[PDB]
Design a protein around this ligand. Structure first.
Ligand SMILES: NC(=O)c1ccc(NCc2ccccc2N2CCOCC2)nc1
Ligand SMILES: NC(=O)c1ccc(NCc2ccccc2N2CCOCC2)nc1
Lengths: 237, 237
C-alpha cells in the first residue's frame, strides 16, 4: 500500500537476511510491504581479484573502499529506484538517529543505503553521491551494514500493515502472578481500565524522570502528566 | 588470547549469522577470538505449539515474552558461562550506548545478551535475571537482536587480534586524483608526514565543531588542538 523500497550497497548483502527472513521485518518483506534490494560493489569490479579496497592518499593505517566499483554500484541502484530516492550514508559523522529522525526518514518511499567498510568511502563520493549522512549512535562498528539494518527495521515499523510519545515504557507483567516472591501490582489485576491507564502513565513519567531526565525537558507535558509526574516525585522523597 | 564469550538469548538465533559468518566479526569468530553462543526460548517450551509469548496483566494491545521458556533459556546460558558473566538486556529504557560504554563493556570476558521481542519481558525478570539495561539509541526496533549484534560488533573491535579520541573522523581520499572535478587536497600528496598529521587533526576538530559542537565540550583539548581549532574557526569567518 504505502509500501517502502530500500536499496542497499554492501560487500555483505547476505547479512541483510537477518531482517529479510525473520520476525516482523521478514513478514513485511514476504507480504510486499517492504522491499530490500542489494547491490554488491564486488560485482562491479573488473580485475581478476575483484578488488574493492584502495590505498588512502596521504598514507595512514587502513584502506578505503575503491571508488570505481563503489560508484558504479551506487549508480545502478539509483537507476533501479527511479526519481525521488534519497541516498543515505551510515557513519559516525552523520546526523544522530532518534525517533523523530526515523519518522522523518519513513516519509520517503525510496531509500538507498550505502554501507561503508574499511576506513570508509572517499570524501568526494559523499559530496556527489550522498544526500544525507546518518549515525545510529556515538560508537564505532566494523561496517555500515548493522546501522543500515537498524535503520531499515526502525522505519519499517511505520509502514501500514507491518505491526498489528517522548517517554520510557512502563513496567510490563505476565504470568505467573508471583515470581521469586515478586508479585504483580494489584492495579493491573483490578480490571479498572482507567486506573490502569493512569498507573502506566505515572510509571512512564517516573521512569523517564529517574533514568533520562533530559528527555522530560523536550516535552510540553499535559496537566494530567504534570499531576502524575508531581505525584511520583512526591512519593520518591 | 584475551578472547570474549557472548551468550545470546533470542527467538531468532539465525539472525546472528550476520555477524558470525562475515567480515571482521566473522574472522574473529573463526579464529576463536570471539564466541557467540545462542539459546532459543522456543527450545525450552513444553506445550505442543512451542508458545513463547503470553498476555499482559492489565490488558493492553500486545504480548510479552512468556516467562517460563525465557527464564529457563537464561539459566541454561548462565550455567554455560560459569561465574562472572554480566547479563545485559537491550532496551530503549537502558543506559545509552556510546564509545565509553563500549570500552566499559569490553572489559568483561563473558556477556549474556537477552533479546526482547513482542512488547518485551516481564519487569520481574529484569530485577532477578538482568544486571544492566543498555540502549543503542533513542529509537524503537522490532527486536533486541539488532541492538545485541550492534553491541557485539562494537566490543569485538577491542579484542586483540580482531583488527590490524572524542572527535569526528577527517575526510579520506583514494584514487582517482580527480573525481567529477573534485581534486584531492595537495597536502595529502606532498608526502610531508607531519603536515599531513596536522591537516587531518585540524579537519577532525573543524568537523567536530561544525557537526557536533557539544562533543567538543567534553574534551580537554591539547595546546595543538586548541591552536588547530582556533585556526579552523578563523578560516570559517
Ligand atoms: N554509528 C554508525 O552509524 C556507524 C556507521 C558505520 C560504522 N562503521 C562503518 C563506517 C562508515 C563510515 C565511515 C567509517 C566507518 N567505519 C569503517 C570501519 O571502521 C570504523 C569506521 N560505524 C558506526
Ligand atoms: N534502542 C535499543 O537498544 C532497543 C532495544 C530493543 C528494541 N526492541 C526490543 C525491545 C526490548 C525491550 C523492550 C521492548 C522492546 N521492543 C519490543 C518490540 O517493540 C518495541 C519494544 N528497540 C530498541
Amino acid at each position: 500500500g504505502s509500501h517502502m523500497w530500500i536499496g542497499v550497497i554492501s560487500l555483505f548483502p547476505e547479512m541483510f537476511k537477518a531482517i529479510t527472513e525473520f520476525g516482523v521485518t521478514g513478514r513485511a518483506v514476504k507480504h510486499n510491504l517492504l522491499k530490500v534490494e542489494c547491490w554488491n560493489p564486488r560485482d562491479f569490479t573488473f580485475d581478476k581479484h575483484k578488488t574493492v579496497d584502495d590505498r588512502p592518499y596521504g598514507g595512514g593505517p587502513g584502506m578505503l573502499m575503491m571508488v570505481q566499483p563503489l560508484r558504479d554500484a551506487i549508480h545502478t541502484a539509483k537507476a533501479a529506484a527511479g526519481e525521488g530516492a534519497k541516498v543515505i550514508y551510515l557513519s559516525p559523522q552523520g546526523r544522530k538517529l532518534d525517533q523523530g529522525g526515523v519518522t522523518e526518514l519513513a516519509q520517503n518511499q525510496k531509500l538507498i543505503l550505502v554501507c561503508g567498510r574499511y576506513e570508509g568511502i572517499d570524501e568526494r563520493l559523499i559530496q556527489t553521491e550522498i544526500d544525507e549522512e546518518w549515525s545510529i549512535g556515538d560508537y564505532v562498528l566494523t561496517g555500515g551494514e548493522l546501522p543500515a539494518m537498524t535503520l531499515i527495521d526502525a522505519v519499517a515499523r511505520f509502514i501500514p500493515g507491518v505491526l498489528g510519545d517522548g517517554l520510557l515504557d512502563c513496567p510490563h507483567y505476565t504470568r505467573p502472578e508471583v515470581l521469586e516472591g515478586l508479585t504483580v501490582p494489584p492495579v493491573l489485576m483490578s480490571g479498572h481500565h482507567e486506573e490502569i491507564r493512569k498507573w502506566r502513565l505515572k510509571q512512564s513519567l517516573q521512569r523517564t524522570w529517574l533514568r533520562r531526565p533530559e528527555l522530560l525537558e523536550g516535552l510540553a507535558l499535559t496537566d494530567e502528566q504534570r499531576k502524575l509526574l508531581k505525584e511520583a516525585q512526591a512519593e520518591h522523597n
